[PDB]
RNA sequence: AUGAGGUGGCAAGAAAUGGGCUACAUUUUCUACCCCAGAAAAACGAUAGCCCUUAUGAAACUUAAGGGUCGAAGGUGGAUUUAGC
């Protein structure tokens with residue numbers, strides 16, 4: 001790491017710096033005064049103050065990247081969002097006013113909710129008691145849950161079952177299915193939950 | 209291929225600058241390149257290799 | 260040959276022939292045969308047009324040059 | 340958004356405001372040539388609204404003040420990539436169609452000089468090549484666009500199709516179009532005959548012709564088509580390109596040759612080339628000269644605000660921060676007011 | 689008094705190649721053009737083949753001038769890697785220092 | 790002569806195994822450009838095979854490059870295993 005340990009990651013948030021001084025607790029004021037004399041890492045080329053920035057979508061693009069092709073990954077992400085928005089607009093126009101109130105057209109909300117639905121609540125981990133490892137069920141922290149949801153989405157889209165179907169359309173269709181609580185990704189989440197329940201009897205094998 | 213004026217001007221420039229005047233192919237330009245440089249055997253770095 | 264020149268010469272050029280033919284057609288449509296090659300090419304409009312065309316062909320082509328050429332051609336073609 | 344939908348009354352008063360195209364007019368005038376992304380937007384929104392801009396207004400002014408007696412004038416819309424050349428040309432095409440002109444609309448001349456699977460040899464001139472697929476597609480589109488005048492226009496020669504089949508003087512041009520469409524082997528010849536007939540009859544006052552060619556720079560450029568001997572083919576060897584070149588001359592009258600440059604889809608041209616000479620080359624500029632170049636520039640702030648408001652009214656900008664002034668400034672910076680970039684960004688924003 | 693018989697052979701090869709360089713140059717020039725008659729080119733081919741084998745420059749092997757090593761020789765100094773490292777490490781080659789960057 | 794010199798010659802594959810390259814494609818293939826395009830898509834896939842030419846050389850079927858021709862195995866790989874903060 002070319003950054004010495006004294007370097008701190010920058011905090012890129014306009015509101016944080018525009019917060020009124022009177023609204024700062026003593027600890028917050030101390031933190032600001034301390035940061036006034038701390039070296040800061042240069043802002044990475046991925047995140048900015050843009051109001052349209054979305055960390056979840058940025059991480060999804062990074063996970064979808066292959067061999068440093070950020071341009072292509074971002075292109076696929078934006079194409080997927082555009083396809084989702086177009087499909088939702090088509091459904092909204094073709095649908096009656098009664099259900100138009102519920103039909104969602106925000107692709108970012110659709111994506112967030114699809115990933116949230118795909119998130120697994122409990123995972124299977126090898127735990128060892130006496131010298132033998134067993135696939136004991138275990139809670140999954142939030143980072144692991146989000147990562148598993150995103151990775152399942154990406155892998156299911158990357159499967160070879162969908163032939164001559166471009167990743168934009170594949171991912172848009174899968175995201176819509178997940179948003180409506182269906183599709184292979186939710187099926188995989190349910191399979192994980194079913195296996196965890198089947199091995200429920202081994203919970204005590206966990207020590208932590 | 210080339211305009212006649214441009215071709216004649218190129219031949220004139222070749223004559224003035226001493227290059228090959230006649231039309232010749234890359235195979236036969238090997239003679240010119242051979243004689244324009246010392247043979248590898250004649251180069252001092254070769255025949256004077258060992259003290 | 261024209262290809263063997265680094266300076267663009269408007270005289271006896273394709274642009275000159277085209278503009279001359281356009282002017283001849285316009286005057287024929289007007290049905291007034293008070294025209295000639297020298298008579299047409301002597302007018303100041305043709306001078307500005309050849310200036311602009313020569314500028315475009317020889318000097319670097321930019322928005323200012325294109326606008327000058329557009330104005331000259333509009334004046335020549337009597338469309339504004 | 341303007342209540343005005345007639346393409347002849349709108350002027351500087353409507354500058355920076357929208358102008359609608361009815362579904363019937365979109366299906367009739369524009370069966371081809373509209374930008375693919377604008378077509379997607381039209382399908383999504385169910386509406387076809389074009390912002391009225393100074394380039395289209397000026398070209399409409401010229402076309403309204405045109406003197407059909409004078410030789411047909413060449414107008415060339417040039418500008419940076421995605422500045423709106425194609426849509427300004429489409430606006431003028433709609434105006435002329437509503438004014439009842441015969442619209443000879445080439446949607447993208449680039450397609451004719453690249454990616455051609457079927458490249459036969461012309462039977463009318465063995466030194467030229469045919470592009471039956473493109474010829475038939477364009478003939479279908481032309482029939483759809485100008486069916487009304489297609490039966491009213493008669494031919495003025497004898498046109499042999501096979502060693503036995505032929506079309507006779509006095510036959511409708513609909514016969515030529517139908518022959519070309521149905522017999523795909525005669526599509527290029529039908530296109531050539533149609534171009535010749537329209538060019539000759541425009542001089543007789545039978546109607547007013549609008550030759551609206553997008554990507555005109557493709558005709559006098561290079562091509563990525565190789566003969567069976569892996570030999571490159573210049574544009575003139577293509578029967579379609581040669582006929583369109585003939586059409587592009589101002590020797591005739593009773594119409595206007597409107598065209599738009601387009602670096603996108605061009606061959607052997609750098610990305611940042613947008614100027615007339617840079618895109619046309621010596622041959623193309625010589626052929627088109629004299630011509631009136633019209634600059635299509637990025638949106639001025641008023642036009643940018645109008646387009647953003649249009650998207651917001653359509654609810655396209657689904658991002659919660661898009662309506663904010665900060666979001667608008669971010670969009671303006673990212674797109675630099677470029678219409679294509681702004682539309683692309685809003686497509687997913 | 690060379691390091692070994694292989695170095696001696698290479699020295700002889702270099703001497704003979706230097707002696708026959710001009711004749712070989714002229715004959716090869718005759719052979720290496722499409723202008724002259726192919727019969728003349730064929731007789732030139734048989735002549736160049738009839739010249740002694742050791743006169744052929746390709747047979748010269750670049751060996752270290754101090755240990756007759758046939759490989760790992762730096763052409764610039766004509767020293768094998770081992771001898772060059774010895775001298776450089778002891779600091780007897782001007783300007784050569786260990787690389788660290 | 791276990792020394793020296795000359796000519797010619799082997800340096801291959803029954804087969805196994807280690808490392809690397811190319812791939813099995815749609816985040817892909819061809820083209821233009823170097824990133825706002827058009828086509829391809831059961832085709833993708835050899836840097837292998839065979840023929841020709843060129844480069845070096847005195848010597849090239851046995852070296853390299855290019856072209857032509859062919860369009861092969863394969864369809865993301867078992868336990869196991871390598872590397873990366």
Ligand SMILES: Nc1ncnc2c1ncn2[C@@H]1O[C@H](COP(=O)(O)OP(=O)(O)OP(=O)(O)O)[C@@H](O)[C@H]1O
Pocket residue numbers: 374376377380388389390391392419420421422423424425426427600601602603678679682683
């Ligand atoms: N006058 C306009 N009114 C409405 N939208 C427009 C206008 N001009 C451009 N656009 C938008 O930009 C896109 C069309 O761009 P257009 O094809 O006109 O650009 P261009 O520069 O002609 O294209 P190219 O990149 O081929 O040169 C669509 O998204 C469309 O909505």
Ligand SMILES: Nc1nc2c(ncn2[C@@H]2O[C@H](COP(=O)(O)OP(=O)(O)O)[C@@H](O)[C@H]2O)c(=O)[nH]1
Pocket residue numbers: 461463464497498499500527528529530531532535578
């Ligand atoms: N098949 C056919 N095509 C024709 C005929 N007349 C014109 N064309 C078309 O138009 C072209 C000939 O145009 P023409 O005005 O004769 O000029 P030319 O191309 O210079 O001979 C042909 O290549 C066809 O595409 C005709 O009688 N038969």
Ligand SMILES: [K+]
Pocket residue numbers: 866
């Ligand atoms: K493998």
Ligand SMILES: [Mg+2]
Pocket residue numbers: 424425426600601
């Ligand atoms: Mg365009």
Ligand SMILES: [Mg+2]
Pocket residue numbers: 746747748749
């Ligand atoms: Mg050697």
Ligand SMILES: [Mg+2]
Pocket residue numbers: none
């Ligand atoms: Mg012995």
Ligand SMILES: [Mg+2]
Pocket residue numbers: none
């Ligand atoms: Mg091969």
Ligand SMILES: [Mg+2]
Pocket residue numbers: none
């Ligand atoms: Mg040879």
Ligand SMILES: [Mg+2]
Pocket residue numbers: 860
């Ligand atoms: Mg193949």
